[PDB]
């Protein structure tokens, strides 16, 4: 399996990029992002093409590709 780099855009326009395996559940990206922002994971919602990313969504399931963008909003 392969890895892709995703760009996570914060409410303040800051970015953290993540190298994620196509089969990894995106809960792990959500946890990492929230840890690095210093906020509870459940205070955030993560969107891809405006649609909510579930904990058990994989990049393969969502059709994600290299350099695709994820947006973070307050829950």
């Amino acid at each position: 399996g392969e890895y892709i780099k995703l760009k996570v855009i914060g409410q303040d326009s800051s970015e953290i990029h993540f190298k994620v395996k196509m089969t990894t559940h995106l809960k792990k990206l959500k946890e990492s992002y929230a840890q690095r922002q210093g906020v509870p994971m459940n205070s955030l919602r993560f969107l891809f093409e405006g649609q909510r990313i579930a904990d058990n969504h994989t990049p393969k399931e969502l059709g994600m590709e290299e350099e695709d963008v994820i947006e973070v909003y307050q829950e």
């Binding site: 970015e15 990029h17 993540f18 190298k19 395996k21 990894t24 559940h25």
Partner: peptide, 12 residues
């Protein structure tokens, strides 16, 4: 800000 790339482990 500097570029930030985090590698997510495949171990869950």
């Amino acid at each position: 800000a500097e570029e930030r790339v985090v590698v997510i482990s495949s171990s869950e």
